[PDB]
Every structure is written in C-alpha cells, then in structure tokens.
C-alpha cells in the first residue's frame, strides 16, 4: 500500500480499499464472540477480558440492546461500537415511530449496514472499527441474526463468530448441529465453545456474557439469568 | 503527484482513480452474465457461498429494483447495495413524480449520472460495484443495460461484468453473431452454458441464481432451485 | 382603489407600419395633483417604448427595473430587442413578485427591429400579456378608453390619422375621469422617426 | 420531387438491362438540368453509375 | 360522498360511493375514491379530494418504497401508521377522513380509520364521508359477526344506497371492492343495480 | 371564461372561449386560453389568467425537457401528476383551474385540475365560470366513442353555450383535434359573434388636436 | 495530507503567486488604449486569425460593458468572459441606484475591489487577467485606465497590455503628444505601434480590431471600426510611410 | 481549489492535462454550411454486444440547437443534461423567442457552469452545437475550459490535426449547399479504421427548418455512393 493506503476515497491500484481493510484488523485483533440461531430463537456470547481486577463486575459489556427484541453483540473499538449501537438504537426507535410496530431484522441490519458503508465511502469520515452481530426473534418471522463487519454488508447467519479467533470458534460452530436445539442447550454450548477458545492460555480471566433472544423470551432480547447460567458456564468448564 | 491517488486528470491525459475502481468490481471473486432474447431478457450470476452457516437465502446479488426491474450486482457487495438502495429509491421518487414507471434505460442512465458526480469532485470516492439491470419495456422489447463506476450506461443483448467477464463476452459474441434469436429457453440455456463454460463446474443447481424477465410475464422472477434445476436438466440433455 | 391610488391613464394604439403610445401627465396623492410633468412613456429603444400606470412609485420602479434587466440583456447579446421578447421579459419581471406585486399595468407600443411590424400588448398587475392588434390601455379609467376606442379606431390608419385618433381618445378620456389628465404625452413611433406632441389639455 | 430522379434511375436500369446505347446516351444528355439542381454528390454519384452502365454492354469504341 | 369498510373471515370489502361535491354542483358523479395504495390494499377518501389525493399518492410511494425494500407485502397496520403520521403531522392543514383497508398474510382482513386530526384505530368496520352521518344506527343494528363475503358485500352496498340516497352530497354509482388472499375484485353498481329502498308515502 | 373537453373515439377534443376581462369590462377578444404543452398534449386554462400560463408554461418546459431525456413521447398521467405536486404545494394559492388533455401511448386521455390541486380523469370536462353551461350540454348530448366531426359539433355547442349564456365569456371559439397521429389547432373555429358596422364616417381628420409642442428625432 | 492553495506571502514578502500571473498576463493577448481628445480608442491583435472561423460573435478583445464605457482583456478567457460580466452587472447596478451612468473610475474601482478580493482571501486563484478600459463621464471627460491582476489599477492616457507591451509603451512614449493629439492623428499613432508590435508588416485589417469612443452630441457612441475603416486607415499609414522612406 | 483550479506561472496544467484528455479518439467532426450545419460523429462500439440505437452522441438539446462532443462521455452527459435545463430557463424567462440562433450564442455563453466553475475537476468533453434559428446558422465549440470559439468547420478526435486539414482542405468553403454532409462523412472516413455503416456512424443536421438526428435509414442512404 504505502501511498494508497491514506484515506478511504483512494482506491487501490488493484481496486481496494485499504482503509477498510485495516480497520478488518482491529476486529481481528479485538477478542472475539459468537452466535447461534437456535431452533426457536437466538443465543449470543462473547468472552469479556478484565483487564484489570479494578473494574467492577461485567463494565462495558460487549452486548448491547438496541431495541426490544433486537440485540447486539460487539467486537472491536468498543467506543465506535458504542456509538453505532447507539445509532442502531436510534434507527429502531424512528422505524417503531413511523411505520409503527417492531423493525424487521433484515431490513435493520440493511439500514446499519448502508449508514455503515456510509462511514467508508468518503475521506474525512473513517471507518467504524467493530464488527457485530444483530439477533431477534419473533413468532412471525422465526429468528434471524446477521452479521456486519467494519465494511460489508449484513449476511444471514444460523451461526456466527467474530474478533480474535474466527476460524477455531467457527470450526466447532459448525460442529455443532444446530436447527433442531433448543436454546437452552444452545446456551451450555456456547459458553462451551467460548471456553474450548484460549481465554487464559495468552490472556487474563474471561467473563462470559450471553444474550438471548426467543419464544422462550416471547421475544423481549435479554441478558440471560447470570445466576442460573453460571452452571451453563460450569457445564462449560467441564 | 496525487494524480493516482485523487480524481484527477493525469499529465498524460487519463483518469487513474476510475480505472482503478473498474479492476474493483473483479475483485471479490464474482461474475455475472446477461443475455438479452426474443422476447424475454434473463440474467444469471454464480453464487459463491463460503460454508453453509451462511443464509443461502439472503446472500444473493440479484434484487427487484421495481415491480418490473430486476438487478445484479458485481462487485463490492457494501457499495452494491448503497447502490441497489439507491435505485430502488430512484425507480419509487420516479414513480412518484410521474405517472408511469420509470424506464429502465432512464433508471440506468439516473445511476450513471449518480455515479458520474462520484467521479467528479474529490470528497468522495466512486462505488466499486458494476450493475447489470433488466426489465421488460413496451415498445422495445426485454431490455437490458449496465451502469458502472464511471457513469457510462449501455450494454445490450449479451453482457457480462465480472472478474472473467471477458471470456464470457467472448462466447456471447460468438453465440449472438450465430444468427438465431433465443426463446425463452434458449436464452436461459445459452446464459446457462456460457456461465457455465466460464467457470466449469458443471453447476449444481445451487450456486447460480437467475433472473428472469419475460414479456408475457412480467416482474423479475427469481427463479427457484426447481426452475433452475428443470433448466439444467433440459439443457444438460 | 390601491391601483387608482396615484391615478394614471396609458394608451397604446397601431397603424399602418407606425405605432403610438400616449399617456397623462398627471402626478398626485389621491386627489391633489403634485406635478404635470410625471413620466409614464419610457424608451426601452429607438423604436420601443412602454407605458406605465399605477402607483407612482411603482411605475418609476418598474421602469427602473426593467430597464436594468434589458441594458444587461442587450449588453449580453448585442442585438436589439425584439418587442414580443420585451413583453415577455416584463411579464417575468412582474410574476416574480406575484405575492407582493408592483400595482402597475405596463403596456408596450413598438416596431420590430427588421421587419418593422407593429406590436402593441399590455399586461396586468400579475404580468398576464394580453397581445393584439388593434389598441391596448391601462390605469384607472381603461374602460373610458375603451369606450372610445371601439369607435375611433380604424384598422391599416396613416400615422397622421392614428396621432389624430390617440390624441382624440386620450383626451376625452383624461376630460371624463376625475384623477388623470392635466397635460397627454404622445409618441408616433415610424420605421424612421419618432414624434413626440404635448397635446392641448385642460389643465385642471 | 425526388421522384424524377429515381424514374431516371429507373429507366436507366431497364436501358441497361435490355442493352440499349443511343437512348442512355441521350438520357445522359438530357438529364443535366436535374444534375444540376440536387446534392452534388448525389448528382455526380448518379452521372458515374449511368456512364459505367453504359459503357459497359455497348462497345461502340468510336463514341465511348 | 360516503365510505365504508367491513372485515370478514379472510378479506375485507369497502364501498364508496362517486359524488365529489363543490359547493351545490356535482363536480364529478363518477369519482374513484377507492386508491388502490397497494396491491392489497386500498383506501377511501373523504373530504378536501385534493388532500386526500395527495396524502394517498405520498402513502403510496413510502409504503410501495418500503415494500420493495422488504421484499415483502406491507402490512395494513403499517400502510395506517404511514397515513395516521402523514394526517397528524399536517392536521392543521391537510383536512381529510380516511379509510384504510386491505389484506396481508400477517393478520388477514384489516380495517382502519384515521379521520381529521390523525387518530389511528383498528375497528371491525368503519364509516366516514359526509353522508355518513346519517347510517349509523343501520349500520350499528344491521351488523353480525362473522359475516360472509357474500354477506359482507350486500350489506355495505344497502349501507352505501342508503346514504346516497339521503345525504344529499353523495349520489352517482357505488364502487365496491373485494379484497383477499386470491386478491382485489373491483365492481361498479349503478343505475337499477342500485339496492332501493323506496319511499312510498301514502298521499 | 368556459373551457371544455371530450375524449372522442381516436383522441382527445378541447374547446375554448376567449374573452379575457379584467373585472367586468371585456379586456382581450382573442385571449389563447388553450395552450400547447407537448406535441401530443394541450391543456386548456381558466381562473387567474397569469398565474395559468405561468403554470403551463413551467409545465410544458419540464415535460419538454423530460421527453428529450428519455427519448420517448411524454404522459399525460405524467403532465397530471406534476401539475397537481406544483398546484398542492401552493394549497390553491395558484388560482389556475386547467382541463389537461393528452394522446400517449397508452390511449388519450383527459383531466381536469382544480386550483387546490384536485384532479380526475373524465370522459368529458369542462371548467371555468361559464363552466355549468358546458357540462349541461355534454350531459345532454354527450355519447360515448363518437367520431371526430360529432365531438368537433359536440364541443362546439357546448362552448357557443357557454359563450351565449354566461357574459363573462365568449368572442371566439379555439378548438384542438388530437389523435394518434393528428395535432390540428383550430384557433377561431366558430365566431358566433361579429361587431356591426360604425354607421357613418366617425373619424377625425388631420387639424384638430392641437399641440403645445412637438419633438422630432429621426433615425438611421 | 490534503492540498492547500498558495495565497501567502514569501520569506521576503512577496505574493510571488499575483506576480506570477501578473508576468503571464503580458504572455499571450495583445491590447493598447491611447486616450486622445474628443475621442479615445483601443487597438487589439487579433491573436487567432485561422480561416476557418467565421467571426460572428463580432467582437473577441474589446467588450461593451456600457454605454458610457468599454474595456478589453488580456488574460485568460475563462477568467476574462466571468469579469465582464461582473463589470457589466456592477455597472448596471450602479445605474438602477442612482439613475446615472457610472463614473469610470467608480467601476474600474469596484472592478479591482474584487480582483483584491480574490487575491486576498480564501483558497481561491488570483484572476489571472488584466484589462484596459476607455470611458466618459461628466465629471472627468475621456479616461482611461488599466488594471492588473493585482487590483492595482492605474489611471493611463498611452498604454499597452499585450505581449510586447514594452515596445509598444516604448514606441507610444516617443511617438505621443498631447494636447495636439486628436482622433484621426490617434488613430494613426495606434495603427503604427501596432504595426511596430507586430513583427508581419503591412497589418490585415482582419488581425486588428479597433473601438472608438466618441462623443456626439450629449451622447456617447462607441464605434467598433469595421473591416474597410480600418485597412483604409492603413493604407493611408502605408502612404505616409512610403512618403516618409522616400523623401531621404 | 473547488473550481477550476491548478493554474502554475503562466499555465494551466489541470486544463491542458483536461484537453489531453479531450483528445479522446471520437472525431466527431462539424461543418457550418450557408443552409445550416451539421455534426457527425462515429460510434464505433465495442464488438456487436453493445447497442447503437439505445445510446447516442448527438443530442437535441433543444428545437434546433444540436450537440456532439468528444471524450468523456459521462462527463458530456451532465453537461448536456445542464445545458438544456439551461436554454429551458431562458425560454422560460424570455417567453417564446423560440429560442435556438439568436439563443446558440447564449448557451454557449452560459456554458460557464461548463467549466468557469469546472467542480474539483473539470470536464473532460469538448462540444459542438448547431443552430439555426436567426436565418443564418451557427456552429460553436466549448471546450473543457475555453469559451465559443465560433467555428465555420472542425474536428475533435484523435486526428482532429489532420481532420481539420482535410477540411481546409477540401475547401469547406462558403458557397457549399446544405448537402455538405457528404464531405462531413469524408471528413470522418479519414479519421475513420472501418467500413463505417449507418449505425457505425451517427450524424445531425440543424437547417433553418429545425435540428434532428439523422435516422439510420438516411445515414446508410448518404454513406451509399460515397
């Protein structure tokens, strides 16, 4: 790159953004998580380092809630993520607003999906470095979860992973038989996978955020109950 | 310097930035063909789908701008659909505005002016994404044109965009100087065998996805496995 | 009322390859007179001429207007105006205030610059150009000049005979109203020469 | 009114199918106002078809 | 003028009558105040017709626009919501009754009314226009439940003659439209095929 | 002012008066009230006769340049759907009620629009304040998919009707014919209405009118 | 990092920018304005002169701006069509304001306003053009003036803008004399240093256009000399200088 | 910096580079005859897969004014989309001159917005427009930076230096009919690596009657006897 690799409006000489693609590298760099589309709903995770035992419990969590029954889950430069959730939130309250009802999944991962390649298109602008997953169920539309990355586009996922290490989570992912589990064993499994990826083999402890989405939830994306899935995550352990 | 770097006019007397941007579109491992008929007009691109935790069902790079116009995309898939929402937005104020639906000549030619003043100023970059789009229209027949990163709309009868979009428009061109018009099975059999030939996989039917717009019938059918399935099987026969 | 304001009485007739464009003289507040010697009649070129009614002030704005948009125009192009272009430009000039319209009602008196043919219009407040062959007016007793008009009029007239018959009707008209008069202007307009006459008017 | 000039091609195609010399040479020579009237290319294109269809049959050497 | 929409079992049915009145003159006997917004649904319009056009023609391209983008019909809600926003936000100056009905494999038959002032409810069926004022206790007594399509249909027609004929802003023909799963059927009763309900006073 | 138009068997026919008045004194006698908008589309104006042909002329300019880029006929649906967007963002402001009427390629069509920027498409219209009488003749005398002379007849009467019954229109009758393949403009096709003679030489010779001063100033 | 104009000074203090396109100026365009009384005038050369164009826009040098006044430019064309607009429209405007025909020098000020305007702020190019103007007025009678792309006009009565401009002030300097110079003897005065100016002797009428400003009789009138105006003034030179070589 | 810009001591380097581009290899050649003018141009599209009827070169943007340009298409599109928006507003204003001779001067004088104010980057298309509608014709050329040029005959092609030649020439001359068309179409074949054919070569005339786009019908009939 070298001379082409300033600003996002200047092409590669082979027709590349280098921009974009090193902002792909902040996501690659930044610790991972996963999702899986359970057979009637949604499960997230994503490990948490504690850098440092002086932060409070789970602070900055890589999950967010972006409306009542759509939930996030973030990789990358937490505070850019932060900002596009908080973009996200604001996209579904406009969309609840005007044609009423609860936002498609599709159609709002589209939409952050467009706001987000406008953030690459041009030059003073740079890219969002994060990269995350959207989840939601609903009784009509079954569950669905699309992944963004920094620069691309939304894609339908039954089962995703993003940040540090994509190709071991997703491995055993796809492992995993998935469209006939219940989201309650999609939760042990998860936690499962999250633990069999290197947590302190390089790094510090991880804490295990999961999310939920589904009929089980009548919808209503929520943190699944730490107490009760702090046996999911011994479950996990073992 | 900067003549290669910003969209500029070169001492030589070239625009460097958008000649880039054309080698974009091949980037990302795509092609897409497009064959123009008797009557009907059908496009097909090869869909590419990296393991199966994917939606097959939402990966694809053909969409319905309107009720009659269909679309394919080639290139980078996040410009791709900034600019199939920005036809789509286009063909509804079009309608909006005036009566009748927007033409799809006059749809193409609105995004190349789209695409024209990327490539004029500076603070902005043109979309990598070359776009193939069909539709039926009275009076002329199926129809088919391309708009690109540069601003230039045309293409017609046989066109193709891709990373080897030149073999195909090889093989087309021979097929279209053999002097026969295709009906509707002989233009997707001929879209199919040149896709085909292209990239030899024989091509199950699952990792191609066609458009079809005929003149008896239409709207852009995104035809199904089991039409592209009954396709394969009559040609491969 | 508001158009009758500052009075005013502007005539615009055609002859046999002449035209002829008169008007009062008359300035004043509603039933004061100020000045004799007011202009209505401008020269928008050798063989071009405009009449102007209404408020004062917004006669000598849109005389002032009109004739910065066409000095720009000629200037631009470097030929002469063409009477139909001028009253096309005059109706522009007045929609673009169509909600805070100049209250004047300007006509246009003139020979083409090359074939020398007679055109007379006249517009509204709004700028609705109201093109014939025959004769136009405007101000607050229009319908006086009409009515005398429809009479006095005779079509393919001598300029003599065409001075004769504005003159005639002009001056009936500022003689039956009660807000114009006090002096008519009139201006013969041949391929060659302009005549200009300050007609014998009673003054009061 | 063109329509004249495409009887002249006409008759000048039949003279040249049945062979004839005398009534081409004087169609050739009557036909110069027309020629003189129209598009010079098209008037001088039309000269030169008529003079090769002449003087390809009839080989009167004397008089070509 | 009078509008009129029923839910039945799987579709809905509205009925409109063709009188656009200015003043005392009929401007147009033969008006179309059934704008088909969408495929599967439609709506009815009463008061200012310019308004009205021009808040339905603005729903039409939103909804026509968001579908495409959803590949997906659009929901009756949805196309109520875009017209409950378009009549509240402008109120004080768009002044127009609105009808709105239609079919969507989401729910089925559904029927709204967002009348002047930008109020969005979800009602069996409803009523709006100038004439219909005047068939409110018909159609409030001569309403069953789970009615027909066939049953549906007679009955908003009487509702529709019968505020034609008493109102004196409505008259003309009476256009009905159909609407479900297998899609919208348009017809046109006129004339004769008026159901009458003649009013022989004894002299 | 009475505007009128009929859709007759293979086009469109629109009728006018043209009697321009300036309150209730006759101003023009051969006011154009129908105005060309494409070569396949007239329209006919009434109401505020400035704030009309301002309107139709921006009309006619926008779809003239529409028509060259795209390269095909324009529409009249199109010609509709601008005329009301332009008349319903001024809320009726433009005091311009137009009878649109059209040949594309879809068939001729007919409209009418009010200044508030209502519109409709009808076999027959007619608008202006004479208007009642125009639409009590077609009413009368109207038959649907009749030719070309008999809606020529058609709207002629219904315009010398108007022009007959309403005082505030009249002098002339400007009609237009448009098909498929036809554009004819008529102009004054019909004056029911001819000025007498001035009885007697009622003139004035040269003489009279004396002058207090006269200015010559001659030209090349 | 992004690219900055240059509209700053030099480690002396120099805009070396303006005088840059100051220097340009006097490459390319040939004009010269002779201010003489009861009339003063402008030569241009006619730089292009290929046979294929047809002249119709009867005028490329000097310009109407109005009709008290006219100039000539010798700069770049795109910048010289945008400034005789503004003249014009600055001209025009004084004219609705205060009903009178703007003062020379008023307008050749505003004209320079902008043209310092544009050399003095924002990230804008200097006007890379500088024009003469001749002009009448009732305060100050004919004047002339020039202006260069620096805003620094100057008030001239013999001066040249062109390419040779040096020769031609040179020759214009030895050969001006006031007072006694009138409209014919300017005339031939202008035909001459043209000729010096311009290497080809005996100058086609057609590679020279020349405008008087005149003043009749309360009116002023600016005369482009046309095609047989001018080449009979040049052969009336032409006989002064074959009586002049011979008489030795 | 946001207009046309990059002007060094005495040049203009982003222009010149502008018109090095305009240099293009379409010849698009023009010629003013005493009835009227005419611009033809070739189209020589890429093997038989593009179309010839769905785009064009020439473009009526107006009753009688005619346009044909040079490289740069896209960048020529915008501009004629801008100009005829342009001699629309002066029709509109100054209603009904019909506006076409006595208006080619005033668009080509309006084609400021062409390049005076270029947009970062200036337009890469040089254009000739025809008019007809003064009694007299007119053919100008605006190119990416200039101005009118008020041209009688030239080219604007990769050999537009000897295109221009032959004009000259062939004596483009004054007297010729409004049949010099066919020199227009010699002109081209100079600059010209084919059999050119009716929809090879695309050409408009403007007489004194009004511009229009000559059909392939009479394109093929004018290349005949050639």
């Not at chain 8, 896209?74 to 928006?85: E, G, I, M, S, T």
Request: charged share 25%.
């Amino acid at each position: 790159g070298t001379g082409y690799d300033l600003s996002a409006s200047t092409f590669s000489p082979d027709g590349r953004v280098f921009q974009v693609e090193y902002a792909m590298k902040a996501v690659e760099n930044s610790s991972t998580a996963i999702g899986i589309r359970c057979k009637d709903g949604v499960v997230f995770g994503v490990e948490k380092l504690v850098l440092s035992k002086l932060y409070e419990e789970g602070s900055n969590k890589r999950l967010f809630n972006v409306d009542r029954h759509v939930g996030m889950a973030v990789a990358g430069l937490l505070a850019d993520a932060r900002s596009l959730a908080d973009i996200a939130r604001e996209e579904a309250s406009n969309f609840r607003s005007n044609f009423g009802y609860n936002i498609p999944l599709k159609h709002l991962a589209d939409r952050v999906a467009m706001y987000v390649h406008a953030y690459t298109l041009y030059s003073a602008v740079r890219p969002f470095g994060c990269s995350f997953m959207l989840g939601s169920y609903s009784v009509n539309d079954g569950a669905q979860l699309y992944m963004i990355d920094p620069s691309g586009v939304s894609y339908g996922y039954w089962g995703c992973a993003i940040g540090k290490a994509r190709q071991a989570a997703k491995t055993e992912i796809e492992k995993l038989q998935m469209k006939e589990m219940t989201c309650r064993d999609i939760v042990k499994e998860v936690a499962k996978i999250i633990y069999i990826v290197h947590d302190e083999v390089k790094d510090k402890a991880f804490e295990l955020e999961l999310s939920w989405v589904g009929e089980l939830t009548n919808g209503r994306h929520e943190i699944v109950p730490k107490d009760i899935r702090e046996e999911a995550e011994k479950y996990a352990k073992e | 310097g900067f003549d290669r770097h910003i969209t500029i006019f070169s001492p030589e007397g070239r625009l460097y930035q958008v000649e880039y941007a054309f080698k974009a579109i091949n980037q990302g491992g795509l092609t897409s063909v497009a064959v123009r008929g008797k009557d009907c007009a059908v496009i097909v691109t090869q869909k590419k789908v990296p393991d199966k935790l994917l939606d097959s069902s939402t990966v694809t790079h053909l969409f319905k701008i309107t009720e009659n116009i269909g679309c394919v995309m080639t290139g980078m898939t996040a410009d791709s659909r900034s600019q199939v929402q920005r036809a789509r937005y286009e063909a509804a104020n079009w309608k909006y505005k005036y009566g009748y639906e927007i033409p799809v000549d006059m749809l193409c030619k609105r995004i190349a002016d789209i695409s024209q003043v990327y490539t004029q100023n500076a603070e902005m970059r043109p979309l990598g994404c070359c776009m193939i789009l069909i539709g039926i229209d009275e009076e002329q027949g199926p129809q088919v044109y391309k708009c690109d990163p540069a601003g230039y709309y045309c293409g017609f009868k046989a066109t193709a965009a891709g990373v080897k979009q030149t073999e195909s428009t090889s093989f087309l061109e021979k097929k279209v100087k053999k002097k026969f018009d295709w009906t509707f099975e002989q233009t997707v059999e001929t879209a199919i065998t040149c896709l085909s030939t292209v990239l030899s996989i024989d091509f199950k039917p699952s990792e191609i996805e066609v458009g079809v717009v005929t003149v008896e019938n239409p709207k852009f059918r995104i035809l199904t496995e089991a039409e592209i399935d009954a396709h394969l099987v009559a040609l491969a026969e | 009322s508001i158009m009758s304001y500052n009075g005013g009485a502007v005539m615009a007739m055609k002859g046999k390859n002449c035209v002829a464009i008169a008007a009062d003289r008359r300035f004043g507040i509603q039933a004061q007179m100020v000045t004799t010697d007011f202009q209505k009649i401008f020269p928008m070129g050798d063989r071009l001429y405009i009449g102007l009614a209404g408020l004062a002030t917004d006669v000598q704005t849109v005389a002032q207007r009109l004739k910065f948009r066409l000095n720009l125009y000629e200037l631009k192009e470097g030929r002469q105006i063409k009477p139909y272009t001028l009253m096309s430009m005059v109706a522009n000039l007045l929609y673009e205030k169509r909600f805070g319209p100049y209250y004047t009602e300007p006509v246009i008196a003139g020979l083409d610059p090359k074939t020398f043919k007679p055109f007379i219009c006249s517009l509204d407040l709004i700028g609705c150009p109201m093109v014939t062959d025959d004769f136009v007016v405007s101000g607050t007793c229009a319908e006086q000049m009409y009515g005398m008009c429809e009479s006095l009029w005779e079509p393919n007239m001598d300029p003599d005979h065409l001075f004769e018959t504005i003159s005639q009707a002009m001056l009936n008209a500022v003689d039956r109203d009660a807000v114009s008069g006090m002096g008519v202007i009139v201006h013969i307009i041949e391929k060659d020469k302009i005549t200009t006459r300050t007609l014998k008017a009673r003054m009061d | 009114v063109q329509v004249k000039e495409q009887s002249i091609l006409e008759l000048g195609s039949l003279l040249a199918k049945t062979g004839q010399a005398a009534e081409l040479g004087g169609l050739l020579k009557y036909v110069r106002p027309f020629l003189n009237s129209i598009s010079k290319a098209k008037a001088a294109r039309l000269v030169r078809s008529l003079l090769d269809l002449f003087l390809d049959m009839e080989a009167a050497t004397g008089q070509e | 003028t009078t509008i009129m929409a029923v839910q039945f079992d799987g579709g809905v049915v509205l009925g409109a009558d063709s009188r656009t009145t200015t003043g005392s003159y009929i401007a147009n006997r033969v008006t179309d105040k059934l704008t088909p917004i969408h495929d599967r649904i439609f709506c009815c319009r009463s008061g200012s017709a310019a308004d009205t056009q021009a808040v339905a023609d603005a729903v039409t391209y939103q909804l026509g626009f968001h579908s495409i983008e959803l590949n997906e019909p659009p929901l009756v809600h949805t196309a109520a919501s875009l017209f409950k926003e378009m009549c509240y936000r402008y109120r004080e100056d768009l002044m127009a009754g609105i009808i709105i009905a239609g079919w969507d494999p989401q729910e089925g038959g559904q029927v709204y009314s967002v009348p002047m002032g930008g109020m969005m409810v979800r009602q069996s069926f409803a009523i709006g226009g100038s004439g219909s004022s005047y068939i409110y206790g018909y159609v409030d007594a001569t309403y069953r439940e789970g009615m027909t399509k066939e049953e549906c249909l007679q009955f908003t027609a009487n509702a529709l003659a019968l505020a034609m004929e008493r109102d004196g802003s409505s008259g003309g023909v009476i256009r009905l439209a159909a609407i479900a799963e297998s899609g919208v059927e348009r017809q046109v009763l006129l004339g004769d095929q008026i159901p009458k309900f003649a009013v022989a006073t004894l002299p | 002012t009475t505007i009128a138009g009929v859709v007759y068997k293979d086009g469109i026919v629109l009728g006018a008066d043209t009697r321009a008045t300036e309150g209730m004194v006759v101003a023009d006698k051969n006011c154009s009230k129908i105005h060309f908008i494409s070569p396949n589309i007239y329209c006919c104006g009434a109401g505020t006769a400035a704030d009309t042909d301002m309107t139709t002329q921006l009309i006619s300019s926008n779809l003239e340049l529409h028509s060259l880029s795209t390269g095909r006929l324009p529409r009249v649906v199109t010609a509709n759907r601008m005329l009301k967007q332009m008349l319903f963002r001024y809320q009726g402001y433009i005091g311009a009620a137009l009878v649109l009427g059209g040949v594309d390629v879809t068939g001729p069509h007919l409209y009418s629009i009010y200044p508030h920027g209502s519109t409709d498409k009808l076999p027959y219209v007619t608008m202006g304040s004479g208007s009642l009488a125009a639409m009590a003749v077609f009413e009368d005398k109207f038959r649907p998919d009749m030719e070309e002379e008999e809606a020529k007849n058609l709207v002629s009467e219904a315009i010398a009707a108007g022009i007959f019954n309403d005082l505030g229109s009249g002098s002339n009758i400007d009609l237009c014919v448009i098909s498929k393949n036809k554009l004819d403009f008529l102009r004054p096709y019909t004056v029911p209405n001819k000025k007498g003679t001035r009885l007697g030489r009622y003139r004035c010779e040269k003489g009279t009118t004396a002058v207090l001063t006269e200015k010559i100033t001659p030209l090349e | 990092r992004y690219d900055s104009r240059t509209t700053i000074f030099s480690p002396e203090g120099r805009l070396y920018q303006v005088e840059y396109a100051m220097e340009a100026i006097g490459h390319a365009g040939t004009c010269l304005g002779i201010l003489a009384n009861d009339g003063v005038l402008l030569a241009a050369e006619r730089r292009n002169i290929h046979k294929l164009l047809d002249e119709v826009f009867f005028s490329e040098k000097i310009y109407k701006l109005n009709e008290d006044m006219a100039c000539s430019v010798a700069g770049i064309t795109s910048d010289a069509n945008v400034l005789t607009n503004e003249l014009r429209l600055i001209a025009q405007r004084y004219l609705l304001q205060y009903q009178e025909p703007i003062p020379c020098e008023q307008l050749v000020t505003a004209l320079c306003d902008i043209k310092q305007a544009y050399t003095q702020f924002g990230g804008k190019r200097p006007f890379g053009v500088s024009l003469l103007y001749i002009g009448w007025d009732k305060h100050y009678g004919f004047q002339l003036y020039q202006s260069d792309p620096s805003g620094n006009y100057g008030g001239w009565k013999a001066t040249c803008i062109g390419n040779n401009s040096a020769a031609a002030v040179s020759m214009l300097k030895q050969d001006y004399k006031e007072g006694e110079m009138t409209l014919k003897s300017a005339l031939a005065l202008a035909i001459k240093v043209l000729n010096k100016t311009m290497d080809v002797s005996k100058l086609s009428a057609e590679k020279v256009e020349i405008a008087t400003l005149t003043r009749e009789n309360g009116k002023t009138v600016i005369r482009v000399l046309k095609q047989k105006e001018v080449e009979q003034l040049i052969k009336k030179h032409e006989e002064e200088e074959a009586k002049a070589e011979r008489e030795k | 910096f946001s207009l046309t810009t990059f002007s060094p001591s005495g040049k203009l380097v982003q222009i010149e580079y502008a018109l090095a581009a305009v240099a293009g290899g379409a010849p698009s050649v023009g010629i003013k005859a005493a009835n009227g003018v005419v611009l033809a141009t070739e189209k020589k599209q890429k093997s038989i897969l593009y179309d010839e009827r769905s785009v064009h070169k020439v473009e009526p943007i107006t009753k009688h004014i005619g346009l044909v340009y040079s490289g740069m298409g896209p960048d020529y599109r915008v501009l004629v989309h801008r100009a005829r928006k342009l001699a629309q507003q002066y029709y509109l204003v100054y209603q009904e001159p019909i506006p076409t001779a006595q208006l080619v001067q005033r668009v080509a004088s309006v084609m400021q917005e062409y390049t005076q104010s270029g947009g970062v980057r200036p337009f890469g298309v040089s254009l000739l427009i025809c008019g007809w509608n003064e009694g007299r014709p007119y053919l100008f050329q605006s190119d990416p930076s200039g101005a009118y040029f008020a041209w009688k005959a030239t080219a604007m092609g990769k050999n537009y230096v000897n295109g221009k030649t032959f004009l000259e020439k062939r004596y483009n001359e004054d007297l010729e009919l409004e049949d010099a068309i066919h020199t227009a179409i010699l002109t081209l074949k100079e600059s010209f690596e084919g059999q050119m054919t009716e929809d090879n070569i695309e050409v408009g005339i403007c007489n004194e009657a009004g511009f229009r786009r000559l059909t392939p019908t009479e394109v093929k009939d004018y290349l005949a006897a050639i």
